[PDB]
C-alpha cells in the first residue's frame, strides 16, 4: 500500500493542474496514507514527507500539506508520532529555512511527547532547537 502512495505522489510531482485540484489530490493521498495501520502507515507517511520536501514540489503546496500532515500526527500513537516528527525534522533540515513554521510546530509536539515520558533532556533539547532569534 505504501508503494501505491509513493507511485501516486511520484505521478503528481510534475502535474500542471490548478492549486486547489493538485492540493486536493495530495490531501486524498494523505487521507489514504493516514487510513493505513502499522509499518505500512509509517512507510506511507515517510513517503509523503519525502515527496513534500522534493524541490520539484512548489513551497505553497508543500507548506500547506506539511501543516495538514502535522495536524494528523497527534492522533497517532506516541512511538509512531515521535519517529515521524524526527524523520520529518531530518528530511526538512536541507531546506530548514523554507519550513521554519512547520519545524516549530513539530518541535513543540515532539517536546510534549518527551515531556509526557519524563525524558526531560530530550524535551529541552528539542525546544532549544527552535530558532526563536
Q: What is the CA radius of gyration of the chain?
A: 15
Resolution in A for the shown PDB structure?
4.1
Cα(63)–Cα(61) distance, integer angstroms? 6
For residue 4, CA distances in Å to 11, 33, 61, 102 come to 10, 10, 20, 26
Instruction: Measure CA of the first residue to CA of the last residue in the chain; give whole Å.
Output: 42
Q: Which of 75, 50, 72, 77 is nearest to 62 (CA)?
A: 50
Experimental method: X-ray
Question: Are 62 and 95 in contact, with CB atoms under 8 Å apart?
Answer: no
Q: Which of 47, 81, 77 is nearest to 65 (CA)?
A: 47
Cα(12)–Cα(75) distance, integer angstroms? 27
- Give the three cell numbers for residue 43: 512507510
Cα(36)–Cα(62) distance, integer angstroms? 21
Amino acid at each position: 500500500m505504501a508503494a501505491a502512495v509513493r507511485q501516486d505522489l511520484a505521478q503528481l510531482m510534475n502535474s500542471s493542474g490548478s492549486h486547489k485540484d493538485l492540493a486536493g489530490k495530495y490531501r486524498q493521498i494523505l487521507e489514504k496514507a493516514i487510513q493505513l495501520s502499522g509499518a505500512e502507515q509509517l512507510e506511507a507517511l515517510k513517503a509523503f514527507v519525502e515527496a513534500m520536501v522534493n524541490e520539484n514540489v512548489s513551497l505553497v503546496i508543500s507548506r500547506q500539506l506539511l501543516t495538514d500532515f502535522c495536524t494528523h500526527l497527534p492522533n497517532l500513537p506516541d512511538s509512531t508520532a515521535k519517529e515521524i516528527y524526527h524523520f520529518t525534522l531530518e528530511k526538512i533540515q536541507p531546506r530548514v529555512i523554507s519550513f521554519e513554521e512547520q519545524v516549530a510546530s513539530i518541535r513543540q509536539h515532539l517536546a510534549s511527547i518527551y515531556e509526557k515520558e519524563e525524558d526531560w533532556r530530550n524535551a529541552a533539547q528539542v525546544l532549544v532547537g527552535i530558532p526563536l532569534e
